[PDB]
Structure formats: structure tokens, C-alpha cells
Amino acid sequence: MQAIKCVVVGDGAVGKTCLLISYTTNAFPGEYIPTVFDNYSANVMVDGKPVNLGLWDTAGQEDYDRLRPLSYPQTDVFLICFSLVSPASFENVRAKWYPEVRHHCPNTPIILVGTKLDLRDDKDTIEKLKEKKLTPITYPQGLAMAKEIGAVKYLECSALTQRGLKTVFDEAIRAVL
């Protein structure tokens, strides 16, 4: 059967590992969010086409610019993530992640995933950011970024609400098929 290997990348503390666990486990981790996410593989059907979706996390390597790209080769789709409530992780999409992934993978589709959706309209979160003269990233902004880097799709999700997860991986697979 056809395999699609998906590599999730992006700033640390963005939700990557949680997101991948929440998805593959169909349940938010809870109070204790595991640190390790072993390489995942499962059969998935999308638009009638059957595929073996492979998922690789990248936690712990975001700061090692020469080790980080060792997972890039032979990748079919990249999920460049960023926290909706973290303007900095957002800016890294254009300053760090996109340029890097594109350099190593000229022809690989990129889904721009926005995470921590559920914290976007959270009073405490919004105030915390306000205290730092900051504001969450809005859908229109995420979409523009996605358009700027030429992403195939711009999705948003919440490993907590588990909303948007399935979409994220299905669109990922479509981007390949």
C-alpha cells in the first residue's frame, strides 16, 4: 500500500507532540502531556484512496540546525505548525521554518497548521498577551502567511478540543494524492 510520510515541524512549545498524540490517540492527553511521540503509522482512507499515513514528530530538535533536517529527505508532506497565541512562533514560519523546509524540499507540499485554537479567545490568555503588547494571530493573518509561503492549505486546530485535527491530516494526505 502507498505510504505518505508526514513530518511535523515548527517552534517548540507550539503543541506539535500533543497535537500528534491527541490525533493518533483520539483523546487529549490531559494534565500530563507526554514528551515522546514514537514514529506513528496507520492505514487511512481519503477520497476513496487507501494510504498508510506515517507521522514523525520533531520535538527536541528545533534548536539543532544540522540535526533537524536529517528527517526532511523522502518526506511527502510537511506540517509547519505555530501557536495561534504565540506571535513569535508565527513569525518563525516565515523567518525560519518555511525557508528551511523549502530549501531541503523544493517540491514538497506544506500545510500551515495554526495550533492552540482554543486559547485564542481565552480571557486569561488574551490578557497575558495584552500585558506584553501582543495579540493572538487571527485567521485572516494565518491565511495570508499560508499564501505568502505558498502553503497548500491553512488550517487551525486544538489538540484540546480535538477540533480540526482530522481535517489537518486529511488535507495533508490530499496534498499528496
Binding site: 500530563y32 514528551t35 514514537d38 514514529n39 503509522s41 498508510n52 527536541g60 530538535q61 539543532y64 540535526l67
Partner: protein, 368 residues
């Protein structure tokens, strides 16, 4: 409503559980794909070497590391009974200990990370040889990506970099004023350095791997006197100034600069000086006349067996940053003495450079 105690138990368990898994995956890579591949005609010896790569060494090491973790977690009857993070002191201490003890052998990973650079090109041969592709699928019955050869060969690179993350979690569950806290902080800084060191080693491999390879091979009629400049044995690397360059170079550049590498098995000198692939506004092709004379420049490998080193005496010594590396002569083989007058960037650099060189000579003496 999980208490810090619960959370802590969770992390300690994740660390241990994932480690058992990793070791198992490591053994599985060895049994499932590598060994059975030796007994095949698909890959050349070189191709097989890229896949294995100090893996056997890595497993022996990892197994030992795991035992220490197993033992450490047994320093208490049952974690599940502890109600205060404070009651885990013995375990936290021992676990942190394991990292400090192995922190240095973990540098052996930089060897793996360097060869993994060749992994892609080799595996993309299955796309070619139906025979090979056949073998791989056979070894991966479940037809699961997470079980392909590529999925195993990336695990080592992922595993080391997970350690600091697990540690920072234990760290966050300990009182900011406790020793457990301070100890973990020591464990974390250590591992980060390990990680950072692996990365630095990779950066070097990316830039000189080519040259290092040419030096190992091409070993002047010699039947592999060195045959091994692994990033696992790079003790120190520095930039130095070549005071006595050949007439060709010296007559154009007052003081040429060399990249110096001190490996357990040899000292390598390489002339860098990069000024190409710059300024978009430029025309080469063929009507450029100048530029493009030869790919490489100056490289040279001095085996520890023929490596002699004397720090040059100075009037205002203790401030001198000069010294000389000598590639002793060889009556047989018919090889003249080669001397390199190198000026380090500072007395500290010289101090470290010589300390490093003496080190490989000292140990060489031991083995021989």
C-alpha cells in the same frame, strides 16, 4: 487532579518506558534489517557501512545506560506509593547520575548523525533494484511505514534530543530551592551540551566530510594506516595561521589560514578560504577567463604514528601562539619530513591545541 507527585511518576515512567522501547527498536534494526543485509548482494560493503555505522557500538552502550536507569528506579520499593515529589530523591539522584556518567559516550551519536547524511541516497536504491525493494518489504510484513528501514535509522537522532525535554519536566516538578532541583539543572545543562556538541560536529561534517573521506581513501599507496576519521573521535578543531606555506600560496597570501582537526587517530590540516557562490552579478560559463582553476586546495593527514609536536620557544614565551606539527620522515616508503609552523589565534588556543595533540600521542603510546 494530578499532584506534582503523580506528574513526576509519569515522567520517570515515560523516560524508562521509552528507553526500553528504543533499546528494543535498536536491537530490532540490527536483527530485522542490518545483519540479514550483510548476508546479501544488494548493497556494496560501503553501502552497508552507511546503514550500520557504529550501531553495534551504540547498542552495547545504550544497553548499559538502560540498566543504570532500571537500577536507579528500583532504589525505591514502589513509585506508585510515593505521595510527595520529595520522596523520589533517591531515584531522581540516580537518574540524573546516569546522564552525567554517560554524557560523554553520548557524543558517539555524532558519528551516526554524520553517516545518516548518506542514508537517503542509499535507500533510494530500493526504488531501483526490485530485488532490494523486495527484501525490505519482506522484513516489514505489517506494511507499516513506522516499521520501514528509514523509520528505524532516524530513531537514534531523535532519542538523544528527547532527553533534555524529559529532564526539564522533572525539573519543573521539583522545589526551586531543593537540591533535587539544583541536581537536575546540572543534568540538563550537561545533556544540552551533548546535543549542542552533536550539532557542532554535524556542522563540521557537512563542510569537511568530503575532504576527510578523500584523506582516508587515497591513502598514498598505504594500505589504510588510519582508515577512520570519525566525528566520534574529533577532540578539537581550530583555525590556525600557516606561517610556512608552500611558495605558491605564501607568495600571494601573507598568512594563509588552515582548519586544524585533532582526531584520536590523526591530525588534519585543511586550507579553507571560501569566496565563491557569492555576488549574483557575475558571469562565469567559460568566457570568465580567471576563476575556476581547481576544486580543492590544500589538505593533509598526519597519522598519530608519525605525528610529532613541539611548541616553539619564544623570547616573550607564555604569550607565544606558535608551535609546529611534524609529519616525520620515512626511510622505507620514501617519505620526507613535513613540518607545519602554525600560529594559533591566541595563547589559550595554543594551550588547548597542544594539550589535545599530546593527548592523542599519549594514548597512542598506551595502546602501542
Amino acid at each position: 487532579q494530578l499532584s506534582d507527585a503523580d506528574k513526576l511518576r509519569k515522567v520517570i515512567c515515560e523516560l524508562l518506558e521509552t528507553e526500553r522501547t528504543y533499546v528494543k527498536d535498536l536491537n530490532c534494526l540490527m536483527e530485522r534489517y542490518l545483519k540479514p543485509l550483510q548476508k546479501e548482494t544488494f548493497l556494496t560493503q560501503d553501502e552497508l557501512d552507511v546503514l550500520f555505522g557504529n550501531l553495534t557500538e551504540m547498542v552495547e552502550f545504550q544497553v548499559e545506560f538502560l540498566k543504570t536507569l532500571e537500577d536507579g528506579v528500583r532504589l525505591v520499593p514502589d513509585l506508585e506509593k510515593l505521595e510527595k515529589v520529595d520522596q523520589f530523591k533517591k531515584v531522581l539522584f540516580s537518574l540524573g547520575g546516569s546522564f552525567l556518567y554517560y554524557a560523554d559516550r553520548f557524543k558517539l551519536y555524532s558519528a551516526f548523525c554524520a553517516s545518516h547524511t548518506k542514508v537517503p541516497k542509499v535507500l533510494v536504491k530500493a526504488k531501483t533494484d526490485t530485488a532490494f525493494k523486495a527484501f525490505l518489504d519482506a522484513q516489514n510484513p505489517r506494511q507499516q511505514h513506522s516499521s520501514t528501514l528509514e523509520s528505524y535509522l532516524i530513531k537514534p537522532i531523535q532519542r538523544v534530543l528527547k532527553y533534555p525535554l524529559l529532564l526539564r519536566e522533572l525539573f519543573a516538578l521539583t522545589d526551586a530551592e531543593s537540591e533535587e532541583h539544583y541536581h537536575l539543572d546540572v543534568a540538563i545543562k550537561t545533556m544540552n551540551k551533548v546535543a549542542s556538541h552533536i550539532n557542532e560536529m554535524q556542522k563540521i561534517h557537512e563542510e569537511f566530510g568530503a575532504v576527510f573521506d578523500q584523506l582516508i581513501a587515497e591513502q598514498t599507496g598505504e594500505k589504510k594506516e588510519v582508515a577512520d576519521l570519525s566525528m566520534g573521535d574529533l577532540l578539537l578543531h581550530t583555525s590556525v595561521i600557516w606561517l610556512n606555506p608552500p611558495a605558491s600560496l605564501g607568495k600571494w597570501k601573507k598568512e594563509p589560514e588552515l582548519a586544524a582537526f585533532v582526531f584520536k587517530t590523526a591530525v588534519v590540516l585543511v586550507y579553507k578560504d571560501g569566496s565563491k557562490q557569492k555576488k549574483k552579478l557575475v558571469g562565469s560559463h567559460r568566457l570568465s577567463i580567471y576563476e575556476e582553476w581547481d576544486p580543492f586546495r590544500f589538505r593533509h593527514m598526519i597519522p598519530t604514528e608519525a605525528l610529532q609536536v613541539r611548541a616553539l620557544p619564544s623570547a616573550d614565551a607564555e604569550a607565544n601562539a606558535v608551535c609546529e606539527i611534524v609529519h616525520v620522515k620515512s626511510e622505507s616508503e620514501g617519505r620526507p619530513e613535513r613540518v607545519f609552523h602554525l600560529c594559533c589565534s591566541s595563547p589559550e588556543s595554543r594551550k588547548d591545541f597542544l594539550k589535545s595533540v599530546h593527548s592523542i600521542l599519549r594514548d597512542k603510546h598506551r595502546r602501542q
